Design a binder for this molecule. Structure first.
Ligand SMILES: CC1(C)OC(=O)c2cc(Br)c(O)cc2O1
Length: 435
């Protein structure tokens, strides 16, 4: 696996031991061969689980999620998928790793797709080896893979709103349930309905993941209501998964705006990962998987693959060459390699709008390519009337950095800046010049 010019896909079924059993063996072999190695974790929670599996091995943990006193002689680095891509983009020297290991390599966030593109190109060039660890590689058509113990799979109508009757099976259950919803707002309504019925509910989403995930260990719960973030190695002690089989899809319209389309069917990879949360204990057969719709290839035309191209066009590889997306996911976007390449100063603005501004990739690109500087927020207020952002059925308003009350009306509308109360609050702070 570790020899140059080779990319290996380690596709053992969910719960087969890729992280706890296979990963330490690969690391020992890499250290024995003096291979400068990088291990890429999707989240800070997975990074913490990896430190437990690799305890006693000389690994440099480039994350504050782990508290370790490094020796300074480690040749193995561990960091998140987003940190790797961020460091490549910035004027920071990233070693050219001989071995690149990506855990939960199915992650479809733009920074993860970009990391796969960069690593696979280095391998194609004959410069590095790579191991992608996932039960569901890109393009998988099997939503029902093998598991540690048998699962009861049931196609059933799943509520997506509060209900009064017709879904007794949901609340009549006495075990623990992990329920995947298409959005934070949809999970809020189902959570409220379950709480009113006497259930103890925890909610998880990208922004709250590390903090709220700890509650799944620290307190008794009946339900976990989660978005698709829990498809990336988050493990639970549960006996049932309820899966709406739906997700939101960011779509770029006429290259001028981003909408959150759907809810629409999840990919087979996502469904297999959601189901994969249960059937993990070989001594507990009969875990349930209730699913409320079919699968479709909704990653085709999904904005994340276009956003991965914007990131890869701005990463130095060799002279004017640009890394391609990983071959099995390369047809998900129609893009000219190099079309998003920015000049030095615009690239710096693009990076800062993402890193400090916390803006979606697409939106950060529109601002930086228009020649606007990071602190210039006039674009948050000079868009067309149809770009007015609404809050509680009335236009959102902020005090500008000049002390003037203005309606939020960005020149470029990206629905992810107001997909929920938390996102809109963060965007309002940005428009006001507060970060
Ligand atoms: C990832 C980030 C920003 O934060 C860390 O926790 C960290 C730790 C080490 Br060690 C390192 O070399 C670099 C790092 O930079």
């Amino acid at each position: 696996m570790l020899k140059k010019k080779q990319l290996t896909v380690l596709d053992l079924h969910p719960g087969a031991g890729k992280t706890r059993r296979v990963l330490p063996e690969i690391v020992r072999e890499a250290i024995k061969k003096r291979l400068r190695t990088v291990i890429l974790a999707p989240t800070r929670v997975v990074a913490a689980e990896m430190e437990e599996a690799l305890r006693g091995l000389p690994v440099r943990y480039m994350t504050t999620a782990v508290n370790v006193t490094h020796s300074g002689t480690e040749i193995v680095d561990l960091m998140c998928h987003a940190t790797f891509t961020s460091r490549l983009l910035q004027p920071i020297r990233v070693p050219n790793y001989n071995l690149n290991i990506m855990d939960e390599a199915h992650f479809t966030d733009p920074s993860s797709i970009a990391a796969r593109g960069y690593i696979s190109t280095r391998v194609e060039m004959g410069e590095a080896a790579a191991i992608f660890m996932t039960a569901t590689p890109p393009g998988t058509r099997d939503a029902f893979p093998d598991s540690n113990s048998p699962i009861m799979d049931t196609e059933v109508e799943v509520p997506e709103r509060a209900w009064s009757s017709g879904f007794d099976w949901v609340t009549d259950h006495s075990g623990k349930t992990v329920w995947f919803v298409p959005s934070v707002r949809n999970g809020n309504e189902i959570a409220a309905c379950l709480t009113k019925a006497g259930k103890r509910v925890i909610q998880l989403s990208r922004k709250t993941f590390e903090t709220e995930f700890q509650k799944t260990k620290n307190q008794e719960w009946d339900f976990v209501i989660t978005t698709d973030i829990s498809e990336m190695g988050a493990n639970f002690k549960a006996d049932r998964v309820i899966d709406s089989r739906r997700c939101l899809k960011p779509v770029i319209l006429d290259g001028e705006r981003v909408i959150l389309a759907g809810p629409m069917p999840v990919t087979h990879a996502s469904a297999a990962q959601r189901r994969g949360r249960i059937g993990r204990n070989p001594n507990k057969p009969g875990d349930e998987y209730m699913y409320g719709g079919g699968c479709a290839e909704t990653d085709e035309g999904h904005a994340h693959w276009l956003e991965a191209r914007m990131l890869l066009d701005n990463i130095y590889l060799q002279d004017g060459l640009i890394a391609s997306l990983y071959r099995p996911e390369a047809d998900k976007v129609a893009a000219i390699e190099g079309e998003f390449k920015l000049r030095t100063e615009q690239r710096k603005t693009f990076v800062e709008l993402m890193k400090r501004g916390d803006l979606p990739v697409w939106l950060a690109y529109q601002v930086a390519s228009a020649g606007i500087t990071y602190t210039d927020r006039r674009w948050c207020f000079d868009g067309t009337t149809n770009n007015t952002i609404m809050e509680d059925s009335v236009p959102a308003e902020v005090w500008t950095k000049y002390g003037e009350k203005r309606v939020l009306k960005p020149r470029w509308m990206d629905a992810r800046v107001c997909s929920d109360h938390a996102a809109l609050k963060s965007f309002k702070e940005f428009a006001a010049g507060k970060r």
